[PDB]
Amino acid sequence: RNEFPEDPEFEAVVRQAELAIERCIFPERIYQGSSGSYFVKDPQGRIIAVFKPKNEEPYGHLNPKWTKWLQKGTGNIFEMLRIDEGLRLKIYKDTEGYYTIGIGHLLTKSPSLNAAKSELDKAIGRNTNGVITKDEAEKLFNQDVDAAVRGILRNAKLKPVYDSLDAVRRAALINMVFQMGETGVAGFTNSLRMLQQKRWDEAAVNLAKSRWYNQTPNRAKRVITTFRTGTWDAYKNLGRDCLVLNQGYLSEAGASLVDQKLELNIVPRTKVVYLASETFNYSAIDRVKSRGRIGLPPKVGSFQLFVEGYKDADYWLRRFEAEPLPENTNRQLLLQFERLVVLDYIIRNTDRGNDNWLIKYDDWVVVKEPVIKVAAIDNGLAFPLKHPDSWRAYPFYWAWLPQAKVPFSQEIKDLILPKISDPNFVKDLEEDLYELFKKDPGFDRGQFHKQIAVMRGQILNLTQALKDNKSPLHLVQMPPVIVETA
Numbered sequence: 001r002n003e004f005p006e007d008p009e010f011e012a013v014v015r016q017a018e019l020a021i022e023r024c025i026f027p028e029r030i031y032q033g034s035s036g037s038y039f040v041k042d043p044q045g046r047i048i049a050v051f052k053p054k055n056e057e058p059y060g061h062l063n064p065k066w067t068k069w070l071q072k073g074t075g076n077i078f079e080m081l082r083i084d085e086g087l088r089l090k091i092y093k094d095t096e097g098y099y100t101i102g103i104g105h106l107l108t109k110s111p112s113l114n115a116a117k118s119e120l121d122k123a124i125g126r127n128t129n130g131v132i133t134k135d136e137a138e139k140l141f142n143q144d145v146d147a148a149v150r151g152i153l154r155n156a157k158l159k160p161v162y163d164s165l166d167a168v169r170r171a172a173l174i175n176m177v178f179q180m181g182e183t184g185v186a187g188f189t190n191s192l193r194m195l196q197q198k199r200w201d202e203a204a205v206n207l208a209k210s211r212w213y214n215q216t217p218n219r220a221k222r223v224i225t226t227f228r229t230g231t232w233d234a235y236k237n238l239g240r241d242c243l244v245l246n247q248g249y250l251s252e253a254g255a256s257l258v259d260q261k262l263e264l265n266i267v268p269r270t271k272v273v274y275l276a277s278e279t280f281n282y283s284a285i286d287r288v289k290s291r292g293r294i295g296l297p298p299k300v301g302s303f304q305l306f307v308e309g310y311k312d313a314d315y316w317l318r319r320f321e322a323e324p325l326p327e328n329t330n331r332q333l334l335l336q337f338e339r340l341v342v343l344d345y346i347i348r349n350t351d352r353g354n355d356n357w358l359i360k361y362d363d364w365v366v367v368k369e370p371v372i373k374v375a376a377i378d379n380g381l382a383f384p385l386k387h388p389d390s391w392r393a394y395p396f397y398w399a400w401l402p403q404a405k406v407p408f409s410q411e412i413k414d415l416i417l418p419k420i421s422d423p424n425f426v427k428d429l430e431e432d433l434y435e436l437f438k439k440d441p442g443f444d445r446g447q448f449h450k451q452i453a454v455m456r457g458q459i460l461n462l463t464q465a466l467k468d469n470k471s472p473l474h475l476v477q478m479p480p481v482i483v484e485t486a
């Protein structure tokens with residue numbers, strides 16, 4: 001299902017990719033990144049493209065790094081709880097004020113610290129003085145996990161649900177019985193009903209209203225969604241929470257869509273593309289049904305054209321500092337840089353570093369070629385649901401570069417103000433992004449609107465920075481805003 005009549009060059013590169021696969025010259029897995037990235041090659045073995053399947057994304061289901069994790073099944077209860085309970089080597093108080101130690105191990109509900117210390121020496125087998133070791137905390141931990149499992153299986157109300165749950169939800173029920181114990185979780189009898197009948201969004205609500213959750217909502221909500229989605233997603237990124245969970249390929253393409261409309265031309269053309277390759281990471285089911293013929297299903301991903309002759313922004317800027325560019329070349333760098341800032345600001349890039357963009361440094365009817373040129377790669381971490389909570393965690397790295405000190409050139413204002421000042425352009429931009437993002441099965445209209453709000457707020461700021469001839473740096477000091485509808 002791959003066709004792009006609007007862009008026949010792109011389609012042609014895609015056609016070489018498929019053909020090369022038919023010929024068993026497979027996209028090869030990039031070592032140089034975290035690993036759901038491939039070098040697409042053509043039938044002659046040259047590298048024509050970079051491909052990032054959605055399901056191999058960092059939060060991705062078929063991500064190679066996290067598959068080992070998915071193998072464990074219920075056996076993830078240990079890490080799950082390590083994450084919720086942390087580790088402490090000295091007596092502390094829990095949320096309710098009860099004496100605790102190691103990984104969530106409750107000593108007593110008594111107010112006396114020596115009751116607790118007493119209860120602790122009994123457990124460990126020595127005089128602890130309220131302080132235990134890593135191994136001691138781990139041994140308490142297993143026993144406490146065993147005890148939880150026993151609590152569930154010794155019980156008539158819990159066991160039925162537990163046996164009917166998939167490996168991941170089972171881990172969630174153990175989590176609760178770790179925290180509240182056998183008798184406590186069995187007082188949820190309603191929610192156990194839903195869990196038993198498999199209705200997840202029903203139950204995901206009732207656990208939302210309890211004395212529990214009320215006490216430990218951050219954790220409770222983490223379990224509730226492990227119940228709702230049958231997955232580990234609440235346990236892999238607490239938190240980014242600035243970004244939609246697994247839509248990087250759409251970020252990637254979207255970044256390229258924006259570049260196209262603003263006519264920046266720093267983003268190598270990127271689109272949503274389907275490919276099947278033996279080199280990808282597929283479920284075992286899929287591997288088997290291929291007959292080893294049916295063949296592998298195509299995966300949906302971002303397909304980004306490959307550009308040659310470029311090096312790390314980092315690589316070049318380091319050299320230009322020791323041996324500075326002549327004014328005329330250096331002005332070409334700056335003009336390229338402005339385009340980058342405009343891109344990143346508009347799409348609100350969250351992870352542009354000096355490794356994430358590339359530089360290439362080399363009367364009449366035709367324009368002399370530029371010596372210097374900028375490619376913006378690795379755009380899948382943009383389009384956030386909202387501004388980051390601590391600007392220090394997700395900054396704009398290029399802001400600390402000296403080039404960020406230079407006032408926006410009239411050239412960028414000329415390129416950019418007529419577009420982003422035209423409400424029909426920004427409208428059109430939102431329709432194009434919409435037609436792009438909605439194609440995702442996990443698309444959510446409410447999430448989209450939030451994304452757009454940020455984008456509209458970024459545009460609002462950019463417009464005035466440009467009118468006032470601010471530097472890129474003064475632009476980022478402008479307080480972040482969102483433009484919200486309803």
Ligand SMILES: Nc1ncnc2c1ncn2[C@@H]1O[C@H](COP(=O)(O)OP(=O)(O)O)[C@@H](O)[C@H]1O
Binds near residue numbers: 396397399400476
């Ligand atoms: N890379 C960056 N990304 C976002 N903002 C930046 C960046 N570099 C500098 N700034 C801006 O510089 C300003 C100086 O820090 P400031 O926020 O005043 O300190 P504080 O956080 O204590 O108020 C900030 O408002 C911030 O917006």
Ligand SMILES: Nc1ncnc2c1ncn2[C@H]1C[C@]2(CO)CC[C@H]1C2
Binds near residue numbers: 030050304307310377
């Ligand atoms: N479109 C691209 N063209 C050329 N090189 C790229 C591209 N995207 C990424 N890279 C390099 C940066 C890497 C990190 O993502 C490390 C080597 C490749 C991939």
